[PDB]
Design a protein around this ligand. Structure first.
Ligand SMILES: Nc1ncnc2c1ncn2[C@@H]1O[C@H](COP(=O)(O)CP(=O)(O)OP(=O)(O)O)[C@@H](O)[C@H]1O
Ligand SMILES: Nc1nc2[nH]c(SCC(=O)c3ccc(-c4ccccc4)cc3)nc2c(=O)[nH]1
Ligand SMILES: [Mg+2]
Ligand SMILES: [Mg+2]
Length: 159
């Protein structure tokens, strides 16, 4: 039995589009993960620390038989495969893979919160997520993504 989950991907170092497309390929290669939907890519001004490069961001849907922790380990392993060496949470990275949603399940462990607890105020997440998951309910707010998404000029259609 598979569950539907959503991942947020980001890159702001180097050939960002290549790193994102390699990430999707690698995610689809883990036993127990199948990438089932892919959003458009957006180019986005960096949020937080601004003296760093512009990001490309997208979202994917996966069908997975993995538990949430097994899925997290696959996300981190993918970052390692793309040579994410920097680990300053505020700083640049070759690849970031974040778990956004895992069905309607909710957890807030010290080091793992799903739904991702910052997604609802990030246009760099909600805009691509709405492209693939408009009618999906975000279980904290209990609102559909299409009712969370908002306009943001710092998020531009890329490609
Ligand atoms: N839903 C989630 N997805 C991925 N990582 C999560 C997570 N909730 C908590 N984390 C934690 O965040 C840790 C550090 O990961 P980083 O990728 O450097 C943070 P970031 O992606 O820059 O910020 P963000 O998670 O606010 O987007 C992970 O090892 C994990 O323990
Ligand atoms: N557009 C864009 N900006 C990004 N900044 C980063 S650094 C980690 C982070 O998410 C982050 C996001 C937001 C704050 C913040 C912190 C405090 C106050 C306001 C914002 C910090 C870090 N990742 C991306 C990305 O993927 N896209
Ligand atoms: Mg992140
Ligand atoms: Mg991350």
């Amino acid at each position: 039995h598979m569950i539907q989950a959503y991942l947020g991907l980001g890159s702001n170092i180097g050939d960002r589009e290549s790193q994102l497309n390699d990430a999707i390929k690698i995610l689809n290669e883990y036993d127990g993960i199948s990438v089932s939907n892919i959003s458009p890519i957006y180019e986005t001004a960096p949020v937080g620390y601004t003296e760093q490069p512009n990001f490309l961001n997208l979202c994917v849907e996966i069908q997975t038989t993995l538990t949430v922790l097994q899925l997290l380990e696959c996300c981190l392993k993918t970052e390692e495969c793309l040579h994410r060496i920097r680990k300053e949470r505020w700083g640049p990275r070759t690849l970031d893979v974040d778990i956004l949603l895992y069905g309607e399940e909710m957890i807030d462990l010290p080091k793992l919160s799903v739904p991702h607890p910052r997604m609802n105020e990030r246009a760099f997440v909600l805009i691509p997520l709405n492209d693939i998951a408009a009618n999906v309910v975000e279980p904290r707010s209990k609102l559909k993504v299409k009712d969370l998404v908002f306009v943001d000029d710092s998020v531009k259609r890329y490609k």
